[PDB]
Design a protein around this ligand. Structure first.
Ligand SMILES: c1cnc2cc3c(cc2n1)[C@@H]1CNC[C@H]3C1
Ligand SMILES: c1cnc2cc3c(cc2n1)[C@@H]1CNC[C@H]3C1
Ligand SMILES: c1cnc2cc3c(cc2n1)[C@@H]1CNC[C@H]3C1
Ligand SMILES: c1cnc2cc3c(cc2n1)[C@@H]1CNC[C@H]3C1
Ligand SMILES: c1cnc2cc3c(cc2n1)[C@@H]1CNC[C@H]3C1
Lengths: 206, 206, 205, 205, 206
């Protein structure tokens, strides 16, 4: 501005879009969940509804630049449409995920992208024994839908889910939450697919 | 990398889109269902809700290339908008199907496309006797909406539906699931239309 | 394909889109309903939900061609966005209609288009007496929203609705179904508007 | 068609879009409601659902033409996207309005536009006493959201709402319906904003 | 209006879009809420639904002009798509916000923009004790999702929410409503993020 505008122009207008990773130049996405609320539980259909936001990080050479060339600009915000983004998907979802945040990411001079969408998800979960002291445990996998391990790998900075933002007066208390990496194989396809498995253990509030 | 982008450009930017099959150059789509959950049953309206993903395969000359000409590239992922896709449709649906996965397909050097959309479908089904030991049986046909047998044929690699991914703690147990090919005639039109008939037999979990 | 692609290109890329009918060059749409299910009935709000598919036919000179010029091609499928389509609308709908089928039509060398969208419609209907043996009767008009009789006419191949595809195990049995043409006048506008009136008579099982 | 296509092209392709009214060149929209059904009433949240269609008229110099120059064409239908339209909005709505009709308007040689969207609206209304003989009364204002009196004025051809199209077998009977013009002031802004206040009085039966 | 068209053309057609604020040229948005109705309360999931409209003001050099050059034009209305707008977001929302108004803003010769979207929001709130005389209190933060304090600051013209437009016959009476500015830090990010905290205290009508 004029610097930022020129920068954005150079990356997006002058180049073709990054065509996604491949076996030859694969990519690693760092996931991390901040759980906000277990909004509702349906014991007649065994689906439960979570609200959270999911931090995604990755890095691309396509998105690098030299700050001195662009008015000492270290980073910028941009629409998620302007860049490639990973197709992280909830495998046991029962309804399409609802986006609760804007679709804007941060890009930085070293090509690192950060993107943190807020979501509401309804996923498969049997709440039997939520009323008990012992509580009930449910799990849901997040991972690329189309990209194998050989193109997209996932990692977590910590197995502990971020519960510091959980709703004080929720109907359900969280006993524990876990974000652990996994490998899976499916009947369609020879290659392994990577996913981060979100496992929550919860119960009704006294 | 550059090597790909060039490929994608050659297939999509330089050519006009494949205009769909015709009697002269017809096409065969291979369908296959992985049932995930029978989410809910409504006995007051006789509609039942399934979550699954539906594997679609087909092949086009339009999409072929020579790997040596494109940096030894065997295959790639792309948006479903970038290519023609078949109009497989649930004939007894009561509500529009909801897409639970991204709209990305895999294309390969020999022109083979694979596309596996995850869906939630509400279809016509009378659950009377779901509580019994015997269970209740329901069926729904999938097939092209507009393309006759003479333009689109359907086939299955197996009559057995893939239940290996079914939800362990679902409200309903699957006794059996079947994907069998069928031929049908409709009053509008002289030609026969092909469909794969999904037949599931299920009951409450006891 | 080479042939078909060229054909499609000539009709759509090289010409401007058909700007809809007018008084001078009017047209006639043939409607026909295949009722599939009466899904639900709400007696607290007097709305009922139907699932069906609605066959639409019409013909345009804009869409004609000579098969010999295009590799003996008699007809083809295409997206509904690529062509003009008629604005048939349910006058007593209480919620926007939901499309249950793809938006693809068939065009033929003589300019005839066929298009059969599958729909779910919620329309105004008082089900009082649906539980009785006598059953209850409800009606809903379908017709162009903006085009008068003088631009769009409607006709039916038969007054009998196609119930051969109705759901065997539906909560409601169909006693009868009727698709009859009508003329209507509205206070806004001098001209008459045409509609096909769908009348169904049904009850619980 | 050739003629019509050329006309449409001249108005839309060759000109930039009408940039909306201003203080200097203000505009008057004529509103008129045809109420179809009071579909449902929720006494636990005090919202009620109406289905109707709302006639909008206005006139622009931008849209004028000479019929002799265009094959004696008096008028035509077109997409609502092709022209500017007014931002009439329900002030006491509790949910986004649902469009039940196509988005097509009629334009005429003297620059007059007519546009009649069918809608379902959920708005704020306490139904307490709907079961009584006396009935209950509710109101909802329609007016531009962003344009003051000084840019958009509203008028009504009649204070009587058009109930001739109301549903015979609705759960609720209409005792009366009124479309009266009003002026309002809001805390944000010095200028007055115009609205047409729809007031309905109704009950069960 | 020949004049207005030319003006609009000069700002939007001839220039590239304002690329959003940065640390170097930051921006201040003035928020203000007019609460219309507390429509419903769900005590089984602890979510409550508000209808309101939210006044947003800010100023940009990009949008300035000289009235003498454009037929003494002081201001104009335009689509929200034609200009940059701030990404104010409800942090404790449980469902995507629904827009109840048109997406039109007012721009003025000194570059000031005003934009007042009407919304329905479902947010996290425990209504326990709404039936009491004492009432129950709930809060929800509004702020940029992606822009730190260093790029977007928020302010309020008054801590008092505008209740003059509240629904006379609502199921719930408003005891008080507050729009107060706040600073927050999140685990992802070193910088502080600004939010205006909407705090309402209410009860059943009795
Ligand atoms: C870029 C993209 N998404 C973000 C999400 C958040 C934040 C910064 C972001 N930056 C913090 C503030 N906004 C909500 C969360 C936490
Ligand atoms: C290409 C395109 N679609 C796919 C869908 C799936 C898989 C691989 C795919 N590869 C497995 C993993 N993702 C969901 C399903 C099963
Ligand atoms: C052209 C356009 N739509 C059609 C819809 C159907 C059919 C033929 C069509 N042809 C029959 C077979 N497919 C579903 C319905 C009935
Ligand atoms: C142009 C635009 N909208 C219209 C809406 C209607 C009519 C004519 C129209 N002409 C009458 C017939 N169609 C529904 C209503 C009433
Ligand atoms: C520009 C943009 N949005 C506005 C919203 C409103 C108003 C003026 C506006 N001007 C007042 C009248 N319309 C609704 C609210 C209050």
């Amino acid at each position: 501005q004029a610097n930022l505008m020129r920068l954005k122009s150079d990356l997006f207008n002058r180049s073709p879009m990054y065509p996604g990773p491949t076996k030859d130049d694969p990519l690693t996405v760092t996931l991390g969940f901040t759980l906000q609320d277990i909004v509702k539980v349906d014991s007649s259909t065994n689906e439960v509804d979570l609200v959270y936001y999911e931090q995604q990080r990755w890095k691309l050479n396509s998105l690098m630049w030299d700050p001195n060339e662009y008015g000492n600009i270290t980073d910028f915000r941009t629409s998620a449409a302007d860049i490639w983004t990973p197709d992280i998907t909830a495998y046991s979802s029962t309804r399409p995920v609802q986006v609760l945040s804007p679709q804007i990411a941060v890009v930085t001079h070293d090509g690192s992208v950060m993107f943190i969408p807020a979501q509401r998800l309804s996923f498969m979960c049997d709440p039997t024994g939520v009323d008990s002291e012992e509580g009930v445990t449910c799990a849901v996998k997040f991972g690329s839908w189309v990209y194998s391990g050989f193109e997209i790998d996932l990692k977590t900075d910590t197995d502990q889910v971020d519960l510091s933002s959980y709703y004080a007066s929720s109907k359900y208390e969280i006993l524990s939450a876990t974000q652990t990496r996994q490998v899976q194989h499916y009947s369609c396809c020879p290659e392994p697919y990577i996913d981060v498995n979100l496992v929550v253990k919860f119960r009704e509030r006294r």
